[model samples]
Every structure is written in structure tokens, then in C-alpha cells.
Target: FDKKHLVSPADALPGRNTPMPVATLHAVNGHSMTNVPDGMEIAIFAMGAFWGVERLFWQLPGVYSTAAGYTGGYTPNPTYREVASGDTGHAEAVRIVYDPSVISYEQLLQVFWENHDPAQGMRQGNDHGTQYRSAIYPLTPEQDAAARASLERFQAAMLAADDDRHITTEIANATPFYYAEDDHQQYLHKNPYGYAGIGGIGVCLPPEA
Candidate 1:
């Protein structure tokens, strides 16, 4: 088959309830990032559980908002359990909305590439599941171009390091990212001490790249 399909369970409680449960920058009105304020750029990606990734983004300068959700899937509205089974084809993801006036798209690109191991395709760290794959989902054409260029530069650096393994991070159009249950949004902030597994590889990122 050229593409994958889904097999939903019979009477699976009709998927988990996903919505904006807290009042935040982008979801201040309990709306999707797509309908947020003007010039408010939105970008999302998957890198493991996303517990740390989302927390990392929320603290970034110019980042107005951030939320953990489900994407890279084929289902209309996927839940955590469904995605975990690998049938819904969703990957755990974090959606980031920022003010370009304070930060550039390239900065977000850096977060995507540096925070985790993009070399490990279809998984991250010990989380052996498709939901943990590395990816960059662009929300606009400008972001698309910037992401591609940044990837090229990052690849050159990786090549110089002699890391022969190809990068498997997926970059493409933004999909319908279903927000996680109310408890998952801004969870790190709510729970001061939580399990966030993110490791830096100590790799150097060129200043100009």
C-alpha cells in the first residue's frame, strides 16, 4: 500500500475529549492555534513524549503560547490511547505559537533539531513507538522555506561530524493537531516536578547555520 489506513475499535468510547482547557497565549479563547491573533506564527513538531519539548518552548522568548497535542496521524480526532496503539497513526506533538517580532522562525528550527535525536527514526530515546518520531510541521509558506534551509544547514554540520546515519525527521504541511486532554496542557507548569526526559547530545550548532 502506498499509504496507511486506520482500524478503529468497536465502541471505543468515541475518542478522548480534546480541547483548550486553560487560558494561554494562543488558546486564550479556547481556540485552535490556527485562529489565534494576527502575525502570530504557529509551528508544531514531535520529539518523544513532548512533556519536555512543550515545556522548553513555553519558556522561549517571543513564544506567546505552547501546547502538547496529537498529530502526524490520519484520524480526524485522535486520543492518547488510540495514538499509543499506533493505529490512529498519531505522534505526540507540541504546537508552538510565537511572535516573530522577538524571535525568528530559524530559532524554532533550532529547537526542533537540537533538543532530541532526530537521527533515530520512528522513535526517540527509550520510547519505542511511532508516536515519538521527530518531525517539523510548518504552518505557513515562509516557515516552510525557512525550515528547509535550516535543515540543509543542519545536515551539512552533521555531515562534517561524520555521522553517517541519515536524518529521519519529517517536514511537511501542518495537519489537524488534536489538543490533548485538559490535564496535559501546560502540565509541567501545573506540576512543578514531573517526568520530562530530554537529553542534549552535546553537539555544536554553528552560529550562522
Candidate 2:
């Protein structure tokens, strides 16, 4: 119960001016995100823990960069502690920069849909709070439409498995992405023994021809 409630925007702790340091190079790809080459597109995904979710995208083809951050919240420059308090309305999410030509957005959405149990609203596995909810923040109009369509497909797939369940993922426009603390980004890679509360429903998006 301590973590079930969220703090109001006014009540949330004030964040700081110190931004998270950019990863000089990706652990998996070794790409330079400090100066991301042109033609790459950005997308944000929130599914359970950012640690595991960010790891999933960074290893995929065409993903130039991935950063664990907080988004879809009202707080300005929120910190990990502030967001974890369940008051900032922010979800722990990953900002992924990928090459559109090499990997389509639709493919990425499929990965997102298949990786987590989106039916559990406001919670994922053992991590229960607003910060752990599933959400998709689209940066563009076309992406908004695509996310909606993907939800439809995913919902249908879920219903086929269990009619009583519902997809709890929030589909919304992009919000300010507050980078988490340095220790939080690429956490699993830094701390091999760290716990990542990541679990998937086993349901998968249909193959696209």
C-alpha cells in the first residue's frame, strides 16, 4: 500500500539541474550517441523496469542508442527517487534512437508488445507503482496512429488467450523525458547481479508479411 498511491504534481519532490551523463558509447553497439548521426528516429517505451527494457532495444538491429529515463509525467526533471514515490505520474521508460530504414517502428512496437504483460495496469511483476506501468509515448502523429493500431492488434491477441484481461498500457503523446540518475542507466550491465523486475505475458504480435 505504501507504493500504490501517487503524489500530486505539486507535492512531488523538486528535481535538480544535474542531468544524467550521456553514455559515450553503447555497451552493445559501441555507437556514439553523444553526436547521433542524422536520419535516426526517436521513440520512448515504458514497460516495467527501464533496465531490462532498454537492454532489449539496444541489442536490436538499427538501434543507435538507448537511454533509461522517466517520462509521461508532470514533474520537471524528475529523479529516480521522486518518480519511484508514485507522485510524479511518470513511468520508468527508455528513449531509443534507431535507424528507420533498418528497423521499422512497427517492428519495434511488436518487440514492446511481446516483452511485457501489458494487462497489469499500474504494476509490473513485483514492482507496483505508477512508475512501473506500461505506456507508449509517441513523438509524432504517425506514431500515435501506429501505436493505437498496435494496441488494437495486441488487445485482440490478448482476448484470444483470456477474455477477462485488458491491456493497461497508456497510449499518449510524448512528454518531457527526464534522464534518470547515472547509476540507473544501463544498470544491469553495470551491476551484473542487479535485480531487474522484468516479465512478459508470452503473447506475441502476429508476424507481419
Q: Where does the lowest 10-residue lDDT sum fall in candidate 1?
A: 1-10
Q: Give the best candidate by lDDT.
A: 2
- Model 1 C-alpha lDDT per residue in residues 70-98, reported as the tens digit of each score: 88676657767777887766779998878
lDDT of 2 by residue, 91-169 (tens): 8999899889899899999999988888888789888888998889999998999888999998898888785687888
lDDT of 2: 0.82
RMSD to truth, every model: 4.1, 3.1
Q: In model 2, which runs have C-alpha deviations exceeding 4 angstroms?
A: 1-6
TM-score of candidate 2 to 2 decimals: 0.90
